Fold this protein.
Amino acid sequence: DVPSKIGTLLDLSATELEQVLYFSKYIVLDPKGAILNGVPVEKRQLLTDEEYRELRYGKQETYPLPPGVDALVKDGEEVVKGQELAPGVVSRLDGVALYRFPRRVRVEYVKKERAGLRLPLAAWVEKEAYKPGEILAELPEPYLFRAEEEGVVELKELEEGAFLVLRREDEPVATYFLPVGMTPLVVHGEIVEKGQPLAEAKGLLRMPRQ
Amino acid sequence: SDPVRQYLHEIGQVPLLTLEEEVELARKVEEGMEAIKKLSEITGLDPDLIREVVRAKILGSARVRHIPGLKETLDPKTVEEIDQKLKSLPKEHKRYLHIAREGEAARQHLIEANLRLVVSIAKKYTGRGLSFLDLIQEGNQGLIRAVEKFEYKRRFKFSTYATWWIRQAINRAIADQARTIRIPVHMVETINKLSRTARQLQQELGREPTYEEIAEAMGPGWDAKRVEETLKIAQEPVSLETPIGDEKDSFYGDFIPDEHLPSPVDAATQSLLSEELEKALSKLSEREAMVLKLRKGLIDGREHTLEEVGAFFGVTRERIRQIENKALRKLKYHESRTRKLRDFLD
Amino acid sequence: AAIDPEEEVIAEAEGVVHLHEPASILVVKARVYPFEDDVEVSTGDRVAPGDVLADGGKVKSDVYGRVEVDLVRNVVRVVESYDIDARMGAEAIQQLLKELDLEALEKELLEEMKHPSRARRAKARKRLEVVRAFLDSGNRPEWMILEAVPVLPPDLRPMVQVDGGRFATSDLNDLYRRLINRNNRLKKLLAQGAPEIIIRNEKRMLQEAVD
DNA sequence: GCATCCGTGAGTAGA
DNA sequence: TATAATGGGAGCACGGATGC
Ligand SMILES: [Mg+2]
């Protein structure tokens, strides 16, 4: 009934009253120190669904990743607006990025072993331990590493560098470590005698990165 | 302005679930229910009460109300005490509380996401006596039942299982709420079968069937009388405001007499009847007239037995029955003489 | 883990776990709070700065927000947001109408009656007329909002058997039926804890029914 | 001052 | 009670208090 009695008492236009009563907009009874767009929320303020949702439940967004394409950022890492989350994805907001349904789980298994190697004394550089990439030794001339045991060969190749395990029967009788710059002359399942060269060391030889 | 559009838009704000997301939410829901069961085991509390408390905390203080199944009224005090009795558990026990919370949240999101399916199903049920939005809400109830009953272990898509409960809810709704005079769902189904039967017969015969033909086509146990009575019982009422004459002037209800309230002629008739009966009972002695009045109930409104009137006047039942007889006899004589009370006999 | 035991992924030996190729990436505005011990708040709880989160009070909250407890990542996450009470419909309107003190508004509108602008005086008068109406009459303004809805006696909206043995009835019965149905459905929807969209829609429909 | 928004436009009979 | 299904459908007039 125009002008509205409810609208006149509460100082609300027909539009605003309509929007509130018909659930098109929220209206603020207790601001509870809310802040929207830099201005603190006043009592009796009219909020849209997006504003009220942003205020009450927070802000966030999910970005789809194309198949077979890995993410650029890390799980749990803070993000800045404009920062690329992936080659095809740019984040619109700032905050914590979370992984949604990782399709591939890569498990790095820890292995602690013990392996022998033989080198010319002049080539070796004495150290109590070796960091990955650190120089193990330097050969003035090509050198041949010779098998000190007899048996069948198990050749286990890492990203770079290799492990070579000699075994008679079931039990491994020897374990050798071939660093980078050392080319194995044997294949898997090959039979070797003592003195028969396993690998060739040519020039500088260093520890693998892994 | 247009509620349908506004609700479609509100529905559109929730994004659809990827298979992974759907499976996740369903999983969280199932594990959640299991966690509520576990909390019921540990706490020795009611699964319902715990569920309502967890739900109350997830939804917030905005919605707090007494639940029909709960033996205890649910108020912020009670949910606070129960929340504290839950948080007072050891770590491994307190785990299930978190599982339950996230379970309820997942339930909420699952429903909110599958809200569109309800629309797409309900749009086909229009014109059945229920409004579009009504069908949507009932379909929503179906959707909720589905979310609660779903098992992700079967590898099926949620839409498949939910569709059944949505259709079921909508059909239940229509069968229940469509008619002004409520017809039990089974009877409704019967009436509808009768409809489709008669329609098949009219489509084959090239004319409307008789009661007998429908009775035949309905199988054993159906005769013409039964079909006729079933059609009679399926009749919907008509509006008193249906306009008669083509104009804004007249209403059907204006032509319908009132058979309940007594006409002035009726009131006059009964009044004259009581007055004439009193005129006739005054020609007797007060005792026999009182006996007749107590025996026919003119006094207190009810008819006394011979033993009660005999005990009221302090005489044998035989005596009071004899007094009743002589009174009736004197009245019959007075009536034969004056012919006054004849006209009231109709 | 997975649906069937044989399809599960179990770690053969000691090692560290890395996640790659996620289906999607969800960026939230949130503050992350790792926990080494039992956590004192659950998921969904609203939290203000200084409140105890986990570890017997060692780790607490910086911002205002809603708590998501992540048991997988072993972190209590707080998504920044508030406790704001902002409502919808005649519930909100009735609330605001209850909080009204008519005398104060009378004073303020009287102050507005002295303004030089004719328009502001006009509006202040038109408001003050309603205010003073409610004041003199002794009517509480919130009575303009219906909690209980009266029902007209059935004889004034009759269901009657006519001549031929059929039934004729008023439209008021149909309207009342609509109202009762939507009301009951709303109560049941609430009792089963339906989400907000469904309840909002139901309430809207209830309003249109009363209308 | 010119864009909305809204309420109302004989009577009896009859049907 | 489980294949999957996911955003509707239809449809003249003048005078007067208000509202931008
Ligand atoms: Mg038959």
